[model samples]
Target: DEAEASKFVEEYDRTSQVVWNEYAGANWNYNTNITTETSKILLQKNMQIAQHTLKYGTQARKFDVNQLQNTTIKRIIKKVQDLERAALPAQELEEYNKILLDMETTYSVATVCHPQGSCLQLEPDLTNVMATSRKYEDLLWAWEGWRDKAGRAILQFYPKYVELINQAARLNGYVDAGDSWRSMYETPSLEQDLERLFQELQPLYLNLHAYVRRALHRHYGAQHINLEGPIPAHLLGNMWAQTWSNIYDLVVPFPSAPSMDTTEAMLKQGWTPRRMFKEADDFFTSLGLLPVPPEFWQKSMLEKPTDGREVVCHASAWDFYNGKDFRIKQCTTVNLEDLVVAHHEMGHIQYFMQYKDLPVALREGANPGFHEAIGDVLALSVSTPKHLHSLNLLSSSDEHDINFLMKMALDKIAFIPFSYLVDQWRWRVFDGSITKENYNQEWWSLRLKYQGLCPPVPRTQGDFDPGAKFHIPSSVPYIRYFVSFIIQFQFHEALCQAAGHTGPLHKCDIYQSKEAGQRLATAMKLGFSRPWPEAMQLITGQPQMSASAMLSYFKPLLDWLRTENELHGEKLGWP
Candidate 1:
């Protein structure tokens, strides 16, 4: 059993190294130097890599893991057997890769035609207007237009993608794609688990949604917003109403509050993009977390290339199968936003380092969400006013004030339902509960049900708005992000409590607290060697994934929102 276990993982790792290097290099090349030649190389390499990886899944299935006594090897085999797109036939497998590349490439290259007679890409184009613009009409246009572009371009592939994944799931001995996705969590009733979590947090999100709606009503007036019903989606300051942090100026409870924007402060302090990366590493080290490998500094694309190469600037964390080869890709700016993101991405770096010693198959998150959450947990603490003040990035150390909590709420609390709903829509689609005919209507309805928001304009069966979001067409399950958003707060609260914190949850940064670091490190070290519930309990001391920590962290904001809504005679829940 031991020899077989060793042989199984050894072969998997040895085979993985070649594809990992080739794939990472290809992504780096294509993302850094966008061109027709580079694009085709990426597609070529991506196709070959998936085919290579699928053979292992097929191989793992045939291996007699039933007799393996090594729990770690057993767990590893289980994960492979349950992997997305794990057990398709060769032709179906190739078609799966083809559909994935088509969807992802279409999403990557999609350009929306604006009234300005220019086609706008998602990154700095529609993303900027979605983030910063307060214009009602333009936000609607960009929102609807980008959806039309991404959704319509690859709209034909949605059902086909669904059918392929479900087929793969059934081949792998699961009910459907939703079952395949949920199996990663090892939670039997994940639909209920998510429902329970979202329901628990719904009051908080509703208060926030209501307050923001009234505030937006005041900004955009009665014509643009309905006082008691769903808020118009485009006006929420996010393309998909995922986050409202950018609209802080218009809806902020205290306009005079010291800014979270750190561009001016970083500029004053001579903080460059390189320095931001350095400080992020320093922050992790301060907590006794592992530092980035030398390879990271030597190879990472930290900032935009000045040579004017058309590159993908969207931030991502990369971990080559080699434990030490972690890198990040972001067109980083020397500002507070990127600084926090630096810590967030570095969180991925720390997680990989902690568990890098494991077998390659086990070198992943405790669950799908843990990877996304781990870095975000560090980010949550690092971005606090107290942490920034300690670094001399902010003048004030006031961390527990209403204005600060409100800003955090705009970004953090406001995101919960949107994250929850993203996969909610997709899960039903996977199960055939939501048919393609009702895709647009049900998409808006789910937004209304969870987020108290609606499309800025009318939608018909012809419109495919869900594809506008990056995750939908890319087929990246969004529950990971939703779980990340919830559990990051849970983790933040736990770490704060571990550090013997006596203040509000938002004020407790775990920097320099090795006690808190030790607790986090213990769980990070587990990787996927254990089930997620066990891994979760090790860090949080809770038997289940709970939003209690999230609720505690945002309690102050929730109370304030309730008071503010009451004062204005605003309704609490959507009608």
Candidate 2:
């Protein structure tokens, strides 16, 4: 039995690694050089890999892994069979793929046509309007139009999606796909934990929300705003109203406080996207991580190509599973924000590199949150004004500015509630807490309940507004982002403590601290070889994820927001 299990695991690892390598190569190709043939080839590889994965999963489920004495082999066998999707019959598996393919096609190519007849893509075009335009009516129109294409257009594929995914979930012993996604965390109280976490952070969100509403009321007029009620969703400056940081220009509490913008300074120094990534690479190696391989430089798409042919420009990282081929495909710009983004993407590559030696099953972070937060934790440090001045990009290293803290809160603290709400809505959808007839209604109710925001225009049953954001239609589990955003600060706090910084949490930059890097690498090196709590313990000295670190990081901002709201005679709570 021991010999049989070992043989099965070895063959599974070899075959799984091959499929993953091909899948990664195919993924890299499609993102970098988009062509019809590449798209087809990418899909071909996706389904083929899924076939192998589910086949192995089925076989592993039939095998008695308990008979194996070897730990790693037993672990791999137990893991390969854990997926709800793995339990699907072949016909249902293809059906699920079709749903995904249709949704992705619709989402990627979704565009709004202008009244004058020109079509615009979401990223560079509509997203730009949503960010900069202060015109309320125009924002409303753009919001409606974008949703009509991306959300409403994808609705036909959605019911079949719910049906098939839930069917597979039942077959694999889950209540539904939502529960299946939650079970991956191996935590029983995740739904309850998310609810409590949001409440713990709600005081900060409310103060921030109340102040933002009062500020917006001045520009958009009281007719469109309510000082005591939910803020108009479209006016928050993000299409999803998830992050309100982009509207810092209109809602800033102090006109004299430095805004933390470095685009001008970066351009003055003649920085390019490549230089930003180079600095990021140096940050990693300075902390004792390996410098990226030669193939990384040769392979990555650092900037958007001018001779562009329908390429996906959303920034992402890739791992080829062969241990040496890792890349980031980003349409990078030469700005401090983009520079921070470069650092973030490089963190993903670093994680991939550190964990690449593991069996394919153990290559990911302990959970999705760990992988996502690794990049964000790097972003938290790399964006510090002190870190920028060290690089000679900024003239002064002004630290602990309230303006800086407020901006960070708007970007990150503002996100926690929305991230929690998105998955909550999906979970409700899967569990029949809401039905097709009330889909849009339930989405708005959750928005009001958790985010305290409402649509600029009336939404009804005809509207599939939840699908407007990429995640709902894309089928990516969104709770990982909620977890990632909260735990990034936890990681930052722990790393700062490890780096032995004696300063405010926001002011502590752990850029070149080998101690901090070594600490994190210990956890990354574990990969998924252990439970997340074990890996988290190795890194943070804490087993359970918490928002206490996050709240402590922004304590100064919380105090300032309360004083500012009182000074301006604005109410501090939304409800």
Candidate 3:
């Protein structure tokens, strides 16, 4: 029995390495190229690995539970359990991969070039359009252009996608794709947990939503927005209305309160694309983490290529060959937003480097949320007034004012509900609770209920608005974002306390705090070897993930918002 278990562990590790190489290579190729060949190869390789793991793991599943107490066996068990959830026959698997690739490519290459008199010219980058554009019509066009392209593709192919997803999940003994997706959490009763978290946070979300609605009404006038109805979605600056900080111009306490303008300071400092990334790298160095290897700067795709080939413009961090080749793929620009994003992406890089020596199975966050939250937690600190002032990037000293607090609340607090609802809708769809006929309707119902948002124009059943955001079409998991936003604050609070901050949590900046860095370093080094709760406990002293920290951090803003809403005669709670 020992011989058999040892043999299984060795084989599993070997196969795991092969699968990792295949996946890493395939992902690189796909990210670099939007071609049919690359897409096909990525799909085939993925399915092959899945099939191999399923076959081997199903047999290994019969091994004694006691034998699995070995760490390697335990890891193999977890890996196999996940693999079996979506294991399928070759033909069915091929079809599933095809849909997956098609959806991915659709999102990757999707772009709109505004036509000129003689030649079509690419419009301003989506990032610039989102950050700089103030004209409602211009914003409307830019938003709709992306939405229509992505929306049509999803609407056309979603039926096939859903059918295959559900079929695969059911074959693997799941209720639906949503059920299969939730199982990845490795926690009991994930649905109940998330629902309870959302319910607890609902009042805060509504206050922000209602405040945003009233602000938009005053700025755009009643003719543009209904006094008591949902806010027109496109007016919110972001394409998805997920983050409203972009529309801070309209919602400020007064027109006189200065906006946080990092672009001017960066321009004055003569910041380049490379300098921007280096600035992010410095944040990690200050944390007592190792400096990014020179190879990261050389190999990373920090900006879009000059050569005219289609590339995915979305920002992401990658570790190829188990962190030996760390890079981030971003269409980087010189602006405050990209600066924050660079820090976020670099968070992934730092995490990768910290855990580089761990076993392949352990070379990740304690959980997906932990990995995602790492960067955001750092970025959150970097964006604060005191931190920005220390960097010599702050243009105004009025960071603690009502306007600034509202801006932060709009971006951070308002985002919580939208992030939760993405997976919420997907899970419902996966379980057959939401059907094709009511897909669009239910989407709006959730938006209205959670986000208090309505379409800028009438949306019909034919529209796949949710898919307009790349994650839906691309089949990327989104619940991690919800978890990240909550836990990032938890991590922030703990790190701040470690750094010996005695004041309000919001004002605490852990930059340059070796004690905070040591705490994070110890936890980061654990990677996923320990259960997530255990790893999380190492820093936060709590085994549970809670949004209480977020509420605590934003108490001043919440109090101000309630008082402001009452004075303005806006309702405080969602209907």
Candidate 4:
């Protein structure tokens, strides 16, 4: 494997040199004079090529083994990686920004001016957004070891520096300057001292949780251990289906790992990175896994429900689809999830396809919401009686089941304080006030308050932490997931209104119709093409985020969670 990677690197380098020589120009990176058609074709080709190469390189899960476990392979891969990293200098970042600007300028007429058409014009602007977003990211990477002394000094005098880089899109007029944008999205770097504390305290907390969960599971047996929603049913279905597809089987049992080639295919959507560094200093410990790599970012994607057994954890039913042909598992019984799988995943696939040709920089959207917004309306329409009636999934009276809508609303309502707490923990850990232990304590306590969820075992104050998850442990990006959940419902409501669904107060038609699907496709595809805020306008005619709209869906869930937690508190129904 090491030898093969080495050969691939040599070939890749040789080919790259030839391509660079052919395309070499004074401003090859920033050559925005390329028209829409020309740029589109070039970007498409480049993206396809990158996809194929990455898929090939990553098909096996061997990269980690090669780098972490195999010394020789790691060295070879490191050299190749180093070369790739060194390929684009800071000036290339600038060129990326320029190309973004050119796209915006050229496509403004089509996306911004036209207003009625699909607004494919916004694609360039989105491309620019991705490019500019990554450049700012690069700037953040330049900070040495982010500690109190150095970080505070930078922040105290260099407010503009952080702001300039963080809201880089404002440089291109993507978001507003005065709108609580920084607080809403920005996350400060975690300092060193905190890491020491976590390193000391986290293992103890982890052992304690494991011990307690085991004890509790033994005590309660099947009744006590509720493994609900932790492993998403839809995800399981996808994994199972992967068995026959051209991909790895994500659904196989834990001991069964995919081949290296298959693992690469799984990770090709995004790069994975290691945790950030911290000094020996100790304090403010948080218990969990180390953070995700600083260099890595993520894209939110959806998948259609698959043909797997539908299992309900607690009161919520897991949903999925089995199309018309696949053998259905008992777990694959969800009708709504099936519809959700197709539309939502379609939204994600569309965005990925659109930016597939771009570099890692432009491959992502403005934020997590940028992707969620694409699938939202379609999700909403799929729930309508008219749409369901056409599919024969619902009867006429089903529209009157406000109970179903309210139950469905639980998903959105549940995410708010829960996501907020998770985000708050990261900020706390990053800000150096809380360690992983404290973060875990806060996670359980806060989650208990909001979502009414608790660990299976009797947890001490700081046990049952969320630090073990990808978001906190690996330091994967998270704020977008939290906000996007709310915004997703908002898109649904707006689309419902646009399609003449009236409101939650009224029974609406067209929910069962393919026409609704078309509307969803239009909004999602356009969303793929434009900046998030602008795309919001094109979809809902709102130039900015709508708190009013969010509140409409948010209030009920808040009430429900508060009441549910209270009701369940006495019996300690859930851990």
Candidate 3 colliding pairs? none
Q: What TM-score should be assigned to candidate 1?
A: 0.93
**lDDT (CA) for every model shown?**
0.80, 0.83, 0.77, 0.35
Please report the TM-score between candidate 4 and the true structure: 0.40
lDDT of 2 at 181: 88
Q: Pick the candidate with the highest TM-score.
A: 2
Per-residue lDDT, model 3, residue 527, is 82
lDDT of 3 by residue, 467-553 (tens): 778788778789988888889999999999988899878878888888878878888898878778887888898899887898898
Whole-model lDDT for model 1 versus the true structure?
A: 0.80
Off by over 4 Å in 1: 43-55, 82-86, 113-119, 256-260, 267-270, 306-308, 397-400
Write the residue-wise lDDT of candidate 2 on 70-179 in tens digits.
88888888888875565677778877876886777678778899778889888667877887799988898789899888889888888888898888888877889899
Q: For model 1, how big is the CA root-mean-square deviation?
A: 2.5
Q: Among these predicted structures, which one has the highest lDDT? A: 2
Quality of model 2 by C-alpha lDDT = 0.83
Among all windows of 10 consecutive residues in model 2, the one with the lowest summed lDDT is 393-402
